[PDB]
């Protein structure tokens with residue numbers, strides 16, 4: 678029933694970089710998804726108390742959300758693009774694991790994921 682602490686967005690000893698791919702992930706990928714009309718359920722960690730989802734964190738053991746990803750990008754938490762791409766994919770997969778096909782939240786995730794896939798297709802080559 679209770680909420681876990683959110684995923685880490687700061688860790689001083691963790692290796693990190695500012696690469697042109699990571700800059701694209703923030704300026705193009707995150708910003709495109711964040712402004713979408715269906716972004717709002719994904720802009721912060723799932724609040725299992727408020728949403729009355731006492732099973733959520735018993736089923737979803739690797740939670741992820743765009744609020745976390747935004748903070749990780751802004752605070753240069755990542756080493757490479759793949760780490761960030763994996764976070765987006767975790768977020769989508771979590772939604773499909775927890776919910777039913779055709780549920781509103783799944784339809785919203787699908788719409789965001791289509792855009793994500795389009796933008797990652799244009800990920801720039803490493804400089």
Ligand SMILES: Cn1cc(-c2cccc(C(F)(F)F)c2)c2sc(C(=N)NC3CCS(=O)(=O)CC3)cc2c1=O
Nearest residue numbers: 717718719723724728730771772775776777780782
């Ligand atoms: C990632 N995520 C996010 C939400 C969510 C977050 C903030 C607000 C809201 C809300 F309620 F205001 F719309 C939803 C939710 S809500 C939800 C939910 N209640 N899912 C049920 C759908 C019907 S079911 O039979 O599949 C049981 C779970 C799942 C998720 C989610 O994964």
